[PDB]
């Protein structure tokens, strides 16, 4: 109940929203049916349109007008945005040459440059080029400010998840808005686009920018607009707030456009009907920039133009139906569309089995346009698992497709030609970033980056300390002229031991077997002391950022940090030059596993547990195939280079090691590789402690990794060998799930050359993802600036064309 009896006179677009039942005059009041009776009349004036004309110039102020062309309008701060152009012979902002903004040029009394965030729903990254003729204002922001060729959204590439990630710097799994539609089993409530429940505060985790600003004494403009308030009125309101006295004036403002998403759904991302919404967005930016120029604020304000996600071609006929796969289709609830989430229709049905649902959905039709996953098996790069609102069963849908439960669902709701929500690496889902203002660089292109990074930059732009978030603070320093955040490397928590030869062969009872001069006796000793370590450890050793017990182990071909707790390396580092040659494992060595005389029996794995364990086999982190000499090859068979691997995963791993590593070395002019295991049993994206481990090799204390990573670094200028690189580096990485089958790869009964590399590409990763997952910190010793290294660690090789 609102007692909507009060008035909006002098209260129009009030910045602090007043408590019910007293009636509201804020920019959100409509969406709560809480506006005062006079709201439309006083606050949503429309009389005479949105532009001055020759004859309106110098008029006597008529308060009924939408915007004013009277002499006093400037001081009052309510001129039509084109006032100085029509009435005072000024040019539109878009027609002025760009001129570097070296310092904020602000009115007296501004304590900091304001920030205006202009967000555009569904503005696909390629619109910047493809619509450039019809967007002259946006193009001036882009070419004159700082821009990326695209910005990567989060998954799912839906509106609420993305806008809330922009607000908070958090993955959907951490901020809680994991979809446009949601069921929270703890609350026993549902969240939908339509309706009331989405307003409840308990959905919305982390700390969004407006709250971060308020808590630190920076005033925030209300970010949210009732959809019926026209764009022109939103702009005029922002311009008005900017004319408030110093003590009342917000420092941050948000404009949101429903376009071009709204049209893109009806017409497809490139439908001829898409030109007009692009034109209309540009005209709005034009009104903002003209308005700012009138207030002499156009070289004072920082402007961010940002989208939430792109838009792909999707139609009704491209729908897969679960009723074509599942005989039990009525015992499940499906969250449908460009992704799928499945749970039980009723928690009192004890015969609902997720395992058989997955199996009934796996590789069933030759061209199947979705792939089922238990959520913990989704690519770790999506960070989409650690929230009770995310159903155990997930369908990753092919771009251009929909999944639905039954055909009735589709023709009882073709309506649409565009949709979004797909995997966030998909090109059609990429969106835009442009920054313009005194704090951004001038005419600068930056590489693509993820929207999780922006909250930190918006905090930097406002002088705020950001709440804990998933950006890597400093990785976007190269967007900024000043206000950079200068981080230190985290301190190493555990120092390693450097064990020498301490154990006799006969002390080892591991059930392991191996059929195995003074010049090269001193030589092998110096290799064990770390003489080739500068060849194999190019960027320093990784720092261990938690308390644990580990050893550095040197060898001719590789260096490793061996964990006495997990009985295996945390990391193994080796360099493969362009010249290097693949040899095979000789037969006298096929099942060779050798005790490592530097490491006690008690901190070692044993062959017997592998023999006993009928499901589990073993692989090696340094590949024997790439040993530098037959003598060095013995080092690769050390029990300390051994890790648990399912036979089905060995197919993957062997092909990577035997074929792909050499291929990358030829193509990249040497590669440095760091490989190791990952334990993420509770799927939170963070290194597990030992008491979190759910699986061991039968009858032993050997813990089973959930994933295996590799980080493959070379010189960005590939005319220089990886081990002799003078400048910036180039990286690609992966986090492969360690799975007892290859059900994920539909063509896996074929030759590894037809499916392994595609699987690795699917599970591409940022070094930073690996850092979270291992508690390690990489590239500690390079000659590059730390900010540049943070940028490299956030890089994701996506394997999408141009
Ligand atoms: C991305 O960045 C984010 C932000 O940095 C990272 O997430 C953080 O990770 C931290 C480490 O896991 C986590 O720290 C925990 O905090 C607990 C206190 O939590 C509350 O307070 C904070 C601060 O204001 C608040 O933000 C939290 O909000 C969460 O919860 C509500 C839902 O209830 C949501 O509104 C909100 O969306 C958010 O949910 C998300 O986080 C939780 C985990 O906290 C998930 O479970 C959800 O699915 C969702 O993803 C909270 O309101 C604190 O209790 C924890 O302490 C336990 O563990 C430590 C180890 O240090 C130990 O000292 C303690 O004893 C304690 O254990 C006790 O409780 C256990 C659990 O009940 C119990 O089993 C034990 O026996 C013990 O008695 C812990 O310190 C932090 O909260 C989140 N922050 C956010 C915002 O998510 C994230 O990791 C990054 N991602 C990646 C990949 O890097
Ligand atoms: C059906 N469906 C789709 O498939 N795509 C859709 C797209 C839109 C709609 C729709 O009309 N809506 C009607 C509403 C329109 C108004 N909105 C906001 O004011 C808003 C802004 C906003 O900014 C956050 C800033 C943070 C700083 O960085 C820039 C962005 N944060 C939110 C929510 C997250 C807190 C909502 C969008 C949401 C609704 C969505 C419905 C859709
Ligand atoms: Ca959207
Ligand atoms: Ca974990
Ligand atoms: Cl959703
Ligand atoms: K076995
Ligand atoms: Na398969
Ligand atoms: Zn949409």
PDB file of C-alpha atoms in Angstrom, residues 26 108 122 144 154 160 188 200 227 326 494 527 581 623 631 634 641 645 662 691 719 760:
ATOM      1  CA  UNK A  26      12.321   8.757  -7.993  1.00  0.00           C
ATOM      2  CA  UNK A 108      35.111  25.161  -9.826  1.00  0.00           C
ATOM      3  CA  UNK A 122      22.546  -6.415 -26.670  1.00  0.00           C
ATOM      4  CA  UNK A 144      39.151   9.526 -29.836  1.00  0.00           C
ATOM      5  CA  UNK A 154      30.156 -13.580 -18.414  1.00  0.00           C
ATOM      6  CA  UNK A 160      20.741  -9.587 -15.421  1.00  0.00           C
ATOM      7  CA  UNK A 188      11.999 -21.808  -1.837  1.00  0.00           C
ATOM      8  CA  UNK A 200      13.732  -8.598  -2.937  1.00  0.00           C
ATOM      9  CA  UNK A 227      11.200   1.629 -18.981  1.00  0.00           C
ATOM     10  CA  UNK A 326      13.661 -38.516 -22.582  1.00  0.00           C
ATOM     11  CA  UNK A 494      56.005 -21.519   1.774  1.00  0.00           C
ATOM     12  CA  UNK A 527      71.960 -31.200 -13.747  1.00  0.00           C
ATOM     13  CA  UNK A 581      62.790 -33.969 -31.415  1.00  0.00           C
ATOM     14  CA  UNK A 623      56.638 -36.261 -21.115  1.00  0.00           C
ATOM     15  CA  UNK A 631      70.311 -40.861 -20.644  1.00  0.00           C
ATOM     16  CA  UNK A 634      65.467 -42.070 -17.163  1.00  0.00           C
ATOM     17  CA  UNK A 641      57.104 -37.206 -12.071  1.00  0.00           C
ATOM     18  CA  UNK A 645      45.348 -40.816 -14.716  1.00  0.00           C
ATOM     19  CA  UNK A 662      56.002 -30.349 -30.513  1.00  0.00           C
ATOM     20  CA  UNK A 691      40.574 -32.647   3.767  1.00  0.00           C
ATOM     21  CA  UNK A 719      61.000 -14.505 -34.629  1.00  0.00           C
ATOM     22  CA  UNK A 760      41.520 -28.788 -25.170  1.00  0.00           C
TER      23      UNK A 760
END
